[PDB]
Amino acid sequence: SHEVEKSGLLNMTKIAQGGRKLRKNWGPSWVVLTGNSLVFYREPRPESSVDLRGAALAHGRHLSSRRNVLHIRTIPGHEFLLQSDHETELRAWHRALRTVIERLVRW
Ligand SMILES: O=P(O)(O)O[C@@H]1[C@H](O)[C@H](O)[C@@H](OP(=O)(O)O)[C@H](OP(=O)(O)O)[C@H]1O
């Protein structure tokens, strides 16, 4: 659970906090996926962390003009987009995030 499943640089923006909409502010983030949370740093203490238990993950093609976007909405209501210009690495992230989120459903 504390172990790192994936880490890498992605572009990210918050879009809601506790169910309230936020102005986007896209920027690069060093992103760390553990066995139960996604952790954001300015570079390789976290700026922020979210628990992924019960998170809703989807494609975010409808939520941005950017290419290769994922949308995550957490149980407390925080919502984020992740994006990369590199479609294969974005797909790798999508699969890793799916794996961790689904794992929290059964364990
Ligand atoms: O800075 P502002 O004036 O608030 O303008 C937003 C800005 O251009 C964001 O880049 C854009 O999101 P994308 O780059 O992800 O397309 C967003 O679109 P949206 O409101 O349709 O999310 C605009 O509202």
Query: What DSSP state is assigned to residue 33?
Result: E
Residue 69 is encoded by which pair of tokens? Answer: 């976007």
Supply the residue whose CA is at minimum distance from atom 3 of ligand 1.
23
Instruction: Write out the H or E segment, with its range, that includes residue 99.
Output: helix 87-106
Ligand 1, closest atom to CA 15? Answer: 22
Resolution in Å, one decimal place? 1.8
Centre of ligand 1 to C-alpha 94, Å, is 23
Domains of the chain: 1-107 (2.30.29.30)
The rounded distance, in Å, linking the Cα atoms of 37 and 41 is: 13
Alpha-carbon separation of residue 31 from 4, 38, 73, 105 (angstroms): 10, 7, 16, 22
Q: Is the dihedral of CA 30, 87, 78, 98 positive or negative?
A: negative
Percent of the chain as helix, strand, coil, to the nearest 5: 20, 45, 35
Q: Assess contact for 31 and 43: CB atoms under 8 A.
A: no
The rounded distance, in Å, linking the Cα atoms of 30 and 10 is: 6
Method of elucidation: X-ray
At 95 the three-state DSSP class reads: helix
The rounded distance, in Å, linking the Cα atoms of 41 and 28 is: 9
Residue of 37, 41, 36 lying closest to 9 (CA atoms): 41
Ligand 1 is surrounded, with C-beta below 6 A, by: 23-24, 64-66
